[PDB]
Design a protein around this ligand. Structure first.
Ligand SMILES: Nc1nc2c(ncn2[C@@H]2O[C@H](COP(=O)(O)OP(=O)(O)OP(=O)(O)O)[C@@H](O)[C@H]2O)c(=O)[nH]1
Lengths: 285, 280
């Protein structure tokens, strides 16, 4: 296992912690070891090791944004960002748990939850208009054109003909999408990455995790994720409160949202997560 | 009425559905702080503290950006009575009795080094230097306050000793190379425990933060944990030159006078008595 293989390193980083009682989340590039108060990104390849300096810079930049919540703070020293390669990266662990959709059936909760989503997305939107932020995060072009190519290459082989025709209609609108690079975009903002303390009182946003796919891009990508997980009414409430309920934005959201399962499937494919891949491919095979 | 009742409107906004009478309120030199599970709300008492709260929020923003190897209180929300919501760093202080175990002591010393390195490094960053106070000849203004306010409370001997201590303090070089927490006692350093050896969670109470001499934070560590443990920290960090030992000792021996001067102004006669122990 990953915990077994990196036993010696983990014992230095987490002294006196039994690596039996640790969790592991799979990434495309990093295996992230989850401890009580912190997470250890272990590179899967030397190429992955070479990306961790940049990642440390990215997470530092995110930790200084005004999002109204926490983010995984890098626990390396600043000079780590100057390295060719890192053998690991330690980040603070954001406390709290995800929110089941059930909770949003209460009207006051939904109001409160939507409001804090808005704060977060407004923070991200404004941060993506900052030249120092834009300079530190990736901003790939024709990502939608390219993403469609990656689905056809990497996911169609796992699909039925029916699933492939379904995917094709969904990929069809992508080539028409405007290529927007205006906001900081988490890129995988499903419910499991948005952590709440519902200890005392109504749900209060603790923070946001799993920034692997972060970029300067289109805010509709993150609103789509929320739409996918929580449905139309809750989305609409976020759009109203944030002032993003225009037809142009809504159109983009709907187009991206229709691809969101495929986004999760492509991710699960690349990071070897089999149950996430099965879920994402639900109705495609 | 109560502080919680008094601020109940704001608390219902900031902490929706949270029973205000279930919260706690700690105090300080400038701020009333309401403690909730995962965050605190800073309220100013003085009209001056209300005006300075924007600056402190911008400072905490900068601190939340640095690489210190641990958490700091992240600004979540500011508004106008002005308020500032900060994250609650989890964990508790480490009892000095923990340092009796030498494997614990090594790990703690190591983590302190990382913190102080981060603080040191940050001092060089001009962005940080701009957003943080860099008061020149701070130690001399202090000495004048001591003479003005404390000498009259003191014996002739006390004044001899104190004057000797302020003399040493004037001869110190005016150093502004590092971010200096300013108040780095055991209470403001929080740890994760009962999951292997103590891991540094984060640091709080940055109100006295400045660009200055790192010997100030190192003295504070030594005050709280003793000179054996500080020596461990000084060796790991490569700070065990005698110039540094001098600045630390000079600064260390002003803590009684600092406490007394604080207690004098605070009208906190218990502290003033303890601070002046030996000076009267
Ligand atoms: N866990 C946690 N506790 C905090 C935090 N901020 C304040 N506290 C607690 O609330 C108290 C309030 O005191 P300070 O934060 O020092 O108050 P202050 O008046 O702003 O500070 P000074 O001007 O330096 O005296 C602290 O001593 C802690 O007990 C925080 O971010 N996390």
């Amino acid at each position: 296992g990953i915990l077994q293989a990196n036993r010696v390193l983990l014992s230095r980083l987490l002294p006196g912690v039994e690596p039996e009682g640790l969790t592991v989340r799979h990434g495309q590039f990093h295996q992230v070891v989850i401890a009580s108060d912190r997470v250890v990104c272990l590179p899967r390849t030397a190429a992955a090791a070479a990306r961790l300096p940049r990642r440390a810079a990215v997470m530092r930049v995110l930790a200084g944004l005004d999002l109204g919540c926490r983010t995984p703070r890098p626990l390396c020293e600043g000079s780590a960002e100057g390295a060719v390669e890192l053998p690991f990266l330690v980040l603070s662990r954001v406390p709290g748990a995800p929110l089941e959709a059930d909770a949003l059936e209460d009207s006051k909760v939904a109001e409160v939850v939507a409001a804090q989503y808005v704060t977060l997305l407004s923070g991200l939107a404004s941060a993506g208009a900052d030249e120092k932020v834009r300079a530190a995060l990736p901003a790939p072009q024709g990502r939608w054109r390219q993403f469609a190519a990656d689905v056809r290459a990497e996911l169609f082989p796992l699909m039925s003909d029916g699933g492939c025709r379904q995917a094709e209609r969904e990929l069809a609108a992508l080539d028409s999408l405007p290529d927007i690079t205006e906001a900081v975009v988490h890129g995988n903002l499903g419910a499991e990455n948005v952590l709440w303390v519902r200890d005392d009182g109504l749900p209060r946003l603790s923070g946001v995790i799993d920034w692997d796919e972060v970029s300067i891009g289109d805010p509709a990508e993150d609103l789509a994720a929320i739409g996918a997980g929580y449905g139309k009414d809750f989305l609409d409430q976020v759009l109203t409160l944030g002032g993003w309920s225009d037809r142009r934005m809504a159109t983009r959201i709907a187009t991206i949202r229709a691809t969101f399962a495929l986004q999760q499937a492509l991710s699960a494919c690349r990071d070897g997560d089999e149950e996430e891949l099965a879920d994402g491919l639900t109705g495609y095979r």
